[PDB]
Ligand binder design. Structure first.
Ligand SMILES: *[C@@H]1O[C@H](CO)[C@@H](O[C@@H]2O[C@H](CO)[C@@H](O[C@@H]3O[C@H](CO[C@H]4O[C@H](CO)[C@@H](O)[C@H](O)[C@@H]4O)[C@@H](O)[C@H](O[C@H]4O[C@H](CO)[C@@H](O)[C@H](O)[C@@H]4O)[C@@H]3O)[C@H](O)[C@H]2NC(C)=O)[C@H](O)[C@H]1NC(C)=O
Ligand SMILES: *[C@@H]1O[C@H](CO)[C@@H](O[C@@H]2O[C@H](CO)[C@@H](O[C@@H]3O[C@H](CO[C@H]4O[C@H](CO)[C@@H](O)[C@H](O)[C@@H]4O)[C@@H](O)[C@H](O[C@H]4O[C@H](CO)[C@@H](O)[C@H](O)[C@@H]4O)[C@@H]3O)[C@H](O)[C@H]2NC(C)=O)[C@H](O)[C@H]1NC(C)=O
Ligand SMILES: *[C@@H]1O[C@H](CO)[C@@H](O[C@@H]2O[C@H](CO)[C@@H](O[C@@H]3O[C@H](CO[C@H]4O[C@H](CO)[C@@H](O)[C@H](O)[C@@H]4O)[C@@H](O)[C@H](O[C@H]4O[C@H](CO)[C@@H](O)[C@H](O)[C@@H]4O)[C@@H]3O)[C@H](O)[C@H]2NC(C)=O)[C@H](O)[C@H]1NC(C)=O
Ligand SMILES: CC(=O)N[C@@H]1[C@@H](O)[C@H](O[C@H]2O[C@H](CO)[C@H](O)[C@H](O[C@]3(C(=O)O)C[C@H](O)[C@@H](NC(C)=O)[C@H]([C@H](O)[C@H](O)CO)O3)[C@H]2O)[C@@H](COS(=O)(=O)O)O[C@H]1O
Ligand SMILES: CC(=O)N[C@@H]1[C@@H](O)[C@H](O[C@H]2O[C@H](CO)[C@H](O)[C@H](O[C@]3(C(=O)O)C[C@H](O)[C@@H](NC(C)=O)[C@H]([C@H](O)[C@H](O)CO)O3)[C@H]2O)[C@@H](COS(=O)(=O)O)O[C@H]1O
Ligand SMILES: CC(=O)N[C@@H]1[C@@H](O)[C@H](O[C@H]2O[C@H](CO)[C@H](O)[C@H](O[C@]3(C(=O)O)C[C@H](O)[C@@H](NC(C)=O)[C@H]([C@H](O)[C@H](O)CO)O3)[C@H]2O)[C@@H](COS(=O)(=O)O)O[C@H]1O
Ligand SMILES: *[C@@H]1O[C@H](CO)[C@@H](O)[C@H](O)[C@H]1NC(C)=O
Ligand SMILES: *[C@@H]1O[C@H](CO)[C@@H](O)[C@H](O)[C@H]1NC(C)=O
Ligand SMILES: *[C@H]1O[C@H](CO)[C@@H](O)[C@H](O)[C@H]1NC(C)=O
Ligand SMILES: *[C@H]1O[C@H](CO)[C@@H](O)[C@H](O)[C@H]1NC(C)=O
Ligand SMILES: *[C@H]1O[C@H](CO)[C@@H](O)[C@H](O)[C@H]1NC(C)=O
Ligand SMILES: *[C@H]1O[C@H](CO)[C@@H](O)[C@H](O)[C@H]1NC(C)=O
Ligand SMILES: *[C@H]1O[C@H](CO)[C@@H](O)[C@H](O)[C@H]1NC(C)=O
Lengths: 318, 172, 172, 318, 172, 318
């Protein structure tokens, strides 16, 4: 002669944290922080470009290992560890400011500079560091300018690139730094060298550094690279008596793409919006504990491993 | 709890209750009984679903790598980024532990309320034909058959039928 | 909701009631009318006005320009500014949404409280003179004139005046 | 014999978001995000100084457009688009850092330097770019230093400014870069050129650059400005042999100001304490969705178009 | 408030109760006595302890110098750090203000219900042997001495022994 | 025959802030924001080094003040205001980056390079700015190179340091800048001057510049400093004909510690995890109102004086 009331219960409950207790036992709960990572770059429905052994800056200069990737259109650009950019010893002035600019870009278009050289200039400078086909070569987009004969002073030559396109072109050039005073006089001459670059927004002078250095790739001499962007209708004029690594082609970035720095293998079976150094993150929930550094539409990083959100009521055993 | 029904006056839940979240365990002359309630269960389910709905609502915020992975970055900006990232991390880590704990507290108490709201729905329906047990039951002072207890659960129970019968049983 | 009054055991209120947030409707031999409560209406508004004033306050954290609207920004540091500002916007957009959801969930159950408290005040006052139907309406077992209905609203209602009179109707 | 209880509700209810329900109907609700902005600068109770056609940096050097406000005190400063900074082509190193110091300040003062030179040096050098009364003029707070006669060599000049005031001053100098080797010897001399700036708190060496380049404002030659702050009590010295224009009077930044940058009509009937490039923001609401870039005391920017706060109770249809 | 026990249907609290947080006072033929229930108080006290354990937790997330407190930092990069440091502060201030404001509301409504839970616990013990006044007090209709008052507090109360004596005084 | 239920209260209750109420009275409360600061630096358990008048950079070059800080290990480094690193006037390029790097270390080790010179070279050139025991000295970890014969030319000497350690090393070198055009001729000679520093990762040339300037510590000349990291196995080469201050020792930073910029008394009986400019912060509360600039395991700085968290029920008066 009685009617009773009560809730449902389970044998094994799930522990959750509350404002009053961190040992609360609810009937059922779910996870909110992702721990699962796919060690693959999910590239389905995505026109990706792997670089393999090429480093982004090599695309603009023409490194032998980066010869494949000198042009293309993409929405995503993948970069690897140990990626070579400089065949011949050296670096680029603010190279990171340039590298992430390429990883933000969605394609590279190449345009000729149209540079004519005199009789006293050997525009066919090569090195054993840059190898193509098997023999010696040079950076694809650049030209090493030396004296035609030993000793003879490099002539004061004026080279001008002009813009015609509606967009802005990124021009690169290098400065050679000889390994000894005796070697310096062979390449350009005994005379004092000065490389002056002039435009409408950029003016800077460079003097070739000469001195003894350790051997890199089998060389003591080094070439450092410089870069600037020229506006539409704007001209860039070079004035030098040797030492300048001339530009044969200028670079032009098409659109906007995504830049991934991961060593993980590629996969076209899955698709992802979130990437890190160890692969892809595919999840609906808003937290992850994999890495603080990610790219794209991503869950926010948290220091905790597990955080359980309760879906059911208090679990009271029988 | 807050509403003091779940783990409150009711000792425990039923591990046999598989067809629902809240139910009845009635005993009469015919025998035993066990049937769950729709409204109470669904009110608890509908609210958790919409609580889970906000969670998976993904932000369309596009981030790009400001910290280089393989190459080196300038040491001073390299400290600024490391500081800002760790400060952002601290916000989202504490914020996460807050949300989880806050939503955990409210849900448990929400599920506690719909239990009490059902108990109050039965107490008012039985009017003066039944008295309160103390452990979450109702002492029915009239002969209530198997179709009679169903009329409570169907929300069709009329106290006017058993008013004269129960009142006299309560007073001898 | 939580207290099961609004959208709970009261089916619905009244659109014709404009002179308050909570009110009484009387039914007797003379006729039918309506009179709103002032105590529980203000008790609900005080909670809301407190909240409404708690967010309209503006703090004076003055922020100065770091990005030029006309001059070009350095690209490498521009990404550091963009990464922080998007992260900050993401925290505030998150905090703005969670607050609205938090406060709206609290205000909706706060109103359920003052309705239940008004119900619990009258219930204990009528004591034995009345019985609740369950639909959110008290039935007294005697006749109340317009003075008898006004006495429950002014909170000055003596249960011992109608104790034996209404206790007679309940048993016949 | 019956008394009923209830709660009021409206016919036209509005929808709000909660923790459990996405669509909840309430009796009344108000907005928490400001969407409306007046496209006018509210300058009531503010001693504002409108820059107009001139640039903030043009005040310290003396642009013909900044003649009406070389000195003056204010609490807020308004910058306009396409503002003339330099009449003679060139840029300032750390241009933005210099710009922000002017936007931090609430008033600029000018203190004379008293720089005299030898008979060989001509300080009356002027340009055709800086037009004053349809003539040939130079910057108001700087003087071009060239050799007296055409073809002469510039002597080794040593000039020193003395900071005697209790507050630090802003010294400004610029290195001129000749458009050719024939122009470099024309008025600076055939000698080797080097400009040195030395003090206790700042020292750096500057060398001019030769080479042909496009004509901006009808000029191939460029002047790049450099800046530092001389501490109270300290002394700054300019050791130059040619290719430097000297400051006639330095700048003193006093008090704190507000930096506003927008192109919108000025209104002195309204008063606001936050501004953006579109207009001004007058709201009590803690959030806004108009622009992520604001200056002053502002509500925090969000990506939400609408967030409603429940002013009333749970609206049930009757 | 939300549960209308503290600052609700009860006029005020007793300022002399040192033993516990919640309790009862009896008025019989032998006199008045003060005793506080141990179990009902612990439930509230332990809930506060859990909040105090959440805010002593070690945020070992270590940070290091980015701004030189003696020398001067470059203007442009130094100005961005200011904007970032102020934004994080502006967030953490709002975080600290919300946490406190909310947590306090919860503790108030926690204790508001934690005696209502005791009020409903005693109500179900006595059942039909006592009636409600409205002020928050149960008046017993049978002869209840000090050893009888002991059982009501000690929960060892049996209403079957006193059922017949009470249901005579009520209906008279 | 009566039993009443109730709760406990107190006379003078604490006021707290709520969501619905500004002024709310409770039976008990506790603070969450820290106002109380400790004006000491708590170094118990911590193996620390107080530098005092010496600057962290001065440990590497060997400024007279740090003759006791050249070698040693710690887990905490304390730096004081108005510190000393330059006895002879000058500045280090990229100083702050160098400064922070030393503060981000837990010990310094030193190894002698052992650079050898010819008969015509004087390595023991000292100054009266770097006084040691009354007599004239020079930075302990550097040697001033001058010609043995006053006036004659300085040899084209080459020096190379070998890195034969598993971990990396830091190297510093100094560049002289004369005050008069006769100083170069009396110390180094009349010939042209150039200094070439070379490694596999870093290389540069910088000429000593002559110019008149104000006197610091009686000295009109300048010695500026430059630094780079030498990788394990790599070499660094100096091509010089004078004007260079060659290092006599290199430096290898050990492990990690904690760098505090504070002018506060040291307490060895006290222990702490957070430190700021004005001392230590010891607390269990999660917030503070003292300083935004803090280091170590430190609670979050908030822009409010006090916020109290209730620890009891609502207080009802009588
Ligand atoms: C840090 O953040 C700032 C602000 O978000 C970024 O500044 C933006 O820079 C991008 C360049 O990448 C700008 O986007 C481009 O705008 C060009 C013209 O904009 C005008 O027209 C729009 C109308 O929609 C006006 O709102 C605006 O005021 C301008 O008047 C477009 O021509 C560009 O399109 C290009 O891409 C498309 C792809 O479909 C191709 O067809 C072409 O290649 C085309 O060139 C582009 O949309 C943007 O305007 C800037 N923001 C603002 C507020 O002005 C910084 O770049 C960012 N730093 C980073 C990412 O490193
Ligand atoms: C980023 O933001 C921080 C603060 O959040 C700024 O750091 C402060 O910079 C200001 C200058 O911009 C400094 O304040 C000024 O100090 C000058 C020297 O006074 C010293 O000695 C006194 C001894 O009594 C100390 O109190 C003081 O701290 C200094 O050590 C004064 O000349 C200035 O006084 C002038 O302003 C005050 C107040 O407005 C008025 O009384 C007068 O108008 C007076 O002329 C001023 O006090 C301060 O040293 C810095 N503080 C901190 C904590 O570092 C950065 O400037 C900012 N970065 C930017 C803008 O790039
Ligand atoms: C900004 O933040 C980043 C990330 O926190 C910092 O970068 C870290 O720098 C430290 C110090 O150089 C690195 O720690 C080192 O790890 C080496 C192990 O190699 C790999 O293993 C780790 C996992 O353990 C991987 O994550 C990664 O692939 C590493 O490459 C050790 O060999 C190092 O030990 C050396 O020092 C000790 C003394 O403490 C000696 O006894 C040893 O002989 C040895 O020489 C060291 O522990 C860390 O790996 C870096 N992380 C990343 C992601 O790059 C930046 O330093 C920081 N920027 C600043 C402070 O400006
Ligand atoms: C047994 C022995 O010692 N080998 C001799 C070599 O010393 C020498 O060739 C080698 O050394 C020279 C300089 O001493 C070069 O570095 C040369 O390599 C190249 C290179 O591939 O990088 C050759 C290029 O032709 C040259 N490029 C030009 C045209 O400028 C570069 C260039 O000198 C440097 O890049 C400048 O920094 O160097 C290397 O193989 C040869 C004689 O060759 S040489 O006449 O070209 O000097 O004789 C070996 O017996
Ligand atoms: C039709 C045509 O092509 N126009 C001819 C002009 O090119 C030329 O004068 C112009 O060019 C010269 C240089 O070739 C100058 O730039 C000159 O402008 C000034 C200026 O900026 O005002 C003149 C100043 O007197 C001078 N300032 C001083 C004192 O140094 C500067 C100065 O040269 C540069 O700023 C240094 O970099 O330049 C401009 O008018 C004239 C012939 O004039 S010329 O004798 O000066 O050569 O002929 C036109 O037909
Ligand atoms: C007022 C007057 O005419 N008296 C002469 C002195 O001024 C002068 O000695 C002093 O002035 C010279 C510059 O001319 C230096 O500042 C010198 O100081 C030192 C220094 O401590 O830095 C002395 C050092 O011994 C020396 N270091 C070495 C070994 O080279 C350096 C160094 O020359 C400078 O740093 C280069 O810029 O300078 C100070 O003593 C003396 C000079 O003649 S003397 O050296 O033969 O005595 O002549 C006085 O008549
Ligand atoms: C670039 O050169 C052309 C002539 O080839 C000239 O007409 C134009 O003015 C130059 N551009 C600029 C920006 O000076
Ligand atoms: C530097 O030279 C040393 C010997 O002088 C040699 O052992 C080492 O291989 C060189 N470094 C490199 C990177 O080749
Ligand atoms: C428990 O089951 C329910 C219903 O199927 C679901 O909501 C919840 O996510 C489950 N928990 C886990 C850990 O899968
Ligand atoms: C009822 O009368 C009392 C006076 O005892 C007064 O406080 C209250 O306001 C009255 N209510 C109405 C609705 O007039
Ligand atoms: C709703 O009406 C009330 C009373 O007039 C007012 O407080 C509130 O601001 C109104 N809200 C809207 C959106 O009209
Ligand atoms: C500035 O130069 C002169 C040196 O003759 C002197 O008045 C003053 O001491 C110098 N100032 C400083 C700070 O050395
Ligand atoms: C509150 O005061 C009581 C004294 O009645 C004390 O026992 C308790 O420790 C205090 N709690 C806090 C959090 O300060």
């Amino acid at each position: 002669d009685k009617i009773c009331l009560g809730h449902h219960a389970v044998a094994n409950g799930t522990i959750v944290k509350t404002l009053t207790n961190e040992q609360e036992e609810v009937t059922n709960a779910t996870e909110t922080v992702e721990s699962t990572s796919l060690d693959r770059l999910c590239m389905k429905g995505r026109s990706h470009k792997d670089l393999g052994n090429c480093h982004p800056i090599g695309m603009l200069i023409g490194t032998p290992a980066c010869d494949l990737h000198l042009t293309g259109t993409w929405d995503t650009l993948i970069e690897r560890e140990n990626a070579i950019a400089y065949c011949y010893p050296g670096a680029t002035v603010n190279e990171e400011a340039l590298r992430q600019k390429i990883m933000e870009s969605g394609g590279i278009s190449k345009i000729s500079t149209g540079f004519t050289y005199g009789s006293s200039i050997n525009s066919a400078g090569t090195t054993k560091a840059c190898m193509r086909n098997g023999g010696n070569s040079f950076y694809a987009e650049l030209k090493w300018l030396v004296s035609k004969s030993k000793g003879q002073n490099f002539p004061q030559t004026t080279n001008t690139y002009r813009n015609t396109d509606t967009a802005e072109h990124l021009i690169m050039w290098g400065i050679h730094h000889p390994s000894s005073t005796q070697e310096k006089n062979d390449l350009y001459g005994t005379q004092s060298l000065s490389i002056s670059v002039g435009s409408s927004t950029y003016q800077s002078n460079f003097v070739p550094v000469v001195g003894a250095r350790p051997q890199v790739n089998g060389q003591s001499g080094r070439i450092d690279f410089h870069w600037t962007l020229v506006q539409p209708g704007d001209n860039i004029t070079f004035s030098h008596n040797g030492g300048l690594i001339a530009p044969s082609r200028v670079s032009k970035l098409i659109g906007r793409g995504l830049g991934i720095q991961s060593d993980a293998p590629i996969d076209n079976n899955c698709e992802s919006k979130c990437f890190w150094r160890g692969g892809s993150i595919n999840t609906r929930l808003p937290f992850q504990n994999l890495s603080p550094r990610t790219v794209g539409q991503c869950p926010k990083y948290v220091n905790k491993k597990s955080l359980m959100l309760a879906t059911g009521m208090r679990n009271v055993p029988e | 709890g807050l509403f003091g029904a779940i783990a409150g006056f009711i000792e425990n839940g039923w591990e046999g209750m598989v067809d629902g979240w809240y139910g009845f365990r009635h005993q009469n002359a015919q025998g035993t009984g066990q049937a769950a309630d729709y409204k109470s269960t669904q009110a608890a389910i509908d609210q958790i679903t919409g609580k889970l709905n906000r969670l998976i609502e993904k932000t369309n915020t596009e981030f790009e790598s400001i910290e280089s992975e393989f190459s080196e970055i300038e040491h001073q900006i390299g400290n600024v980024i490391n500081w800002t990232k760790d400060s952002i991390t601290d916000i989202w880590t504490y914020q996460a532990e807050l949300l989880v704990a806050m939503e955990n507290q409210h849900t448990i108490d929400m599920a506690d309320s719909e239990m009490l709201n059902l108990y109050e729905r039965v107490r008012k329906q039985l009017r003066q034909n039944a008295e309160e047990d103390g452990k979450g039951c109702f002492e029915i002072y009239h002969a209530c058959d198997d179709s009679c207890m169903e009329s409570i659960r169907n929300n069709t129970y009329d106290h006017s039928q058993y008013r004269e019968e129960a009142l006299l049983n309560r007073l001898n």
